[PDB]
Every structure is written in structure tokens, then in C-alpha cells.
């Protein structure tokens, strides 16, 4: 849509950033709008949706139990672990860890979920079973946020991420209760206030997950739409900028506002 392209090109000029996005209609399976959709961007914490989807896939296959309790130590804590650092003595269930990784973006929680999958290599192998030949996780938290330009480790493309999220969130990669559990966690996202949610019309559905990383990287993945209607997958990444957090937040929100205005 010409509206959105005006917005994104202004962001790229104002902030000096590389911006990419894709909007995928889940009812039709068609890309509704996109920009740099085949370019790579760092996933940052948006990988956590994929990690929890992979865990739920193992649950569905009888290989894993959501109420299994994980015990961990202070030595497992990485930067920004607001939930996991409270449970060094009693541990956490896998459901609680997924909830922490998605709703709070807890970094140790993300690592502990990854561990159940066989690490970044195991998550990448799960993505290949979904037909995603592009997305790759290579490192753990917090090194995966480094976002060195030209480094393809820990990246996706907006088109690849949108297609993979469709399969997880509205497709049949997961059982209906498991798919709804992933949606529930994403609906409960506590750390994406100033992004797509700031543009969302009253009463609309949104399930999302944000990310922030090195070299000004910022991003969000989401399913959103009017209530009771098939949603669209929205993927927005930006990187390589000196822009402030406030400016990067506003950029993503302005793209969302343009998408909403002509939904």
C-alpha cells in the first residue's frame, strides 16, 4: 500500500535504518503488503515465539510435558531474567518458563526452553520441518542479539518469519489447545506497549512478541485483526541505526498505524 511505503521510506531516511516488514493474510495465505521482505534481520527475542512453538510441538507428540519442573542455578542466569531469578530455589515448570519467555521476554527462560529442544541447532531443525529454509538460530541469550551487519547468524526474513508464524498460530503445526496456549502467552505480552498495541483499534485481537538488539535493532512479530475475524501476521524489523529506543518504538508503531488505517 502506498501509505505504508511512504511511512517506511521516511523512517529509513529519518533514522538511517534498514527496515523490513511483511503482512500475511492468514485466511488467504497471501502476502498483503511487504518491504525488504526477503532481506535478513536479527530475530532478537522474537525467536522466543518459535522456541515455545517447538516445545509445544514436542508436547503434542508426547515427547514433553508442560508441567515438567526445571531446576536451575544462579550460574544459568543471563542479563534480564526478571522471573527466573526469583526461582533459583524452587525451579519453574516448562509452562511457567514459556510464559516468562514470551510475556516478560525473560532471557534465561528463553535459554532454558531452548535447552529442552537441543539448543539453537534443535530449534533450527524444527523450523526446517515447518518448511522454513531461511530462519536460523545459532547462539543463546544474550549473544544472539549482537546484530553485527552482514552476520547471518540468528536471523530471519520478514517473509520467512511471517510464513512460519502463520503455521504455528493459525495453521496446524500445533494442536488447537496448544496453538491457543501460544496465542494466550503472546496476548499477555507485557513489554510491547509502545509498538503495535499503541495503534490497535479498541477491541481488536493482538498476540505479539517484541525484540531489541545490538546496533539499534528492534522488531515485533504479531497476529492481529478485528475480533472474530481471521487475523493477519505482521512482522516488522529494523536495524543498523543510532536512533533512540523512543524513536525506534515510534517507527514500528507508525508502521502499525499505517497498516491499521487501511486494514
Author numbering: 26 to 238, 240 to 252, 254 to 290
Sentences from the paper on this structure:
The TEM-1 β-lactamase model system has been extensively used to study protein evolution. β-lactamases are a class of enzymes that are produced by bacteria in order to provide resistance to bactericidal β-lactam antibiotics through hydrolysis of their core β-lactam ring. We apply EVcouplings to computationally design variants of the model protein TEM-1 β-lactamase. To examine the structural effects of these mutations, we obtained X-ray crystal structures of designs 80.a, 80.b, and 70.a. Aligning these structures in 3D to a published WT TEM-1 structure (PDB: 1XPB34) revealed that all three have nearly identical Cα backbones to WT TEM-1 (0.26–0.61 Å RMSD over all Cα atoms).
We also searched for local structural changes by examining differences in all pairwise distances between residues, which showed small changes in a one looped region for all three structures (positions 255–257) and in a second loop of 70.a (positions 53–55). Both 80.a and 80.b have 55 amino acid substitutions relative to WT TEM-1, of which 80.a has 15 mutations in the core of the structure and 80.b has 19 in the core. The 80.a and 80.b designs also had a 4-fold increased MIC of aztreonam, as well as a 16-fold increased MIC of ceftazidime. The two designs that were optimized solely for predicted fitness (i.e., distance unconstrained) both conferred resistance to ampicillin, with the greedy optimized sequence (opt.a) having a MIC equal to WT TEM-1, and the parallel tempering optimized sequence (opt.b) had a large decrease in MIC (roughly 100X less). In summary, nearly all of the designs were able to confer resistance to ampicillin including a design with 84 mutations relative to its closest natural homolog (70.a) and two designs with over 50 mutations (80.a and 80.b). Most of the rest of the distance-constrained designs (98.a, 98.b, 95.a, 95.b, and 80.b), which all had more than an 11 °C increased melting temperature, also had increased activity on at least one of the four tested β-lactams. To investigate the structural basis for the increased Tm (80.a had a 24 °C increase relative to WT TEM-1, 80.b had a 18 °C increase, and 70.a had a 6.3 °C increase), we tallied the total number of hydrogen bonds and the number of atom pairs in contact (1.7–4 Å) in each structure. However, we did observe literature-reported globally stabilizing mutations such as M182T in every one of the designed sequences, which has been shown to confer a 7.5 °C increase in Tm as a single substitution. The 70.a, 80.a and 80.b designs also showed increased resistance to aztreonam (80.a and 80.b had a 4-fold increased MIC, and 70.a had a 32-fold increase MIC, see broth microdilution assay in Figs. 4, 5). There are five shared mutations near the active site that are in three designs (M69A, E104T, P167T, E168A, E240G) that may contribute to this increased resistance.
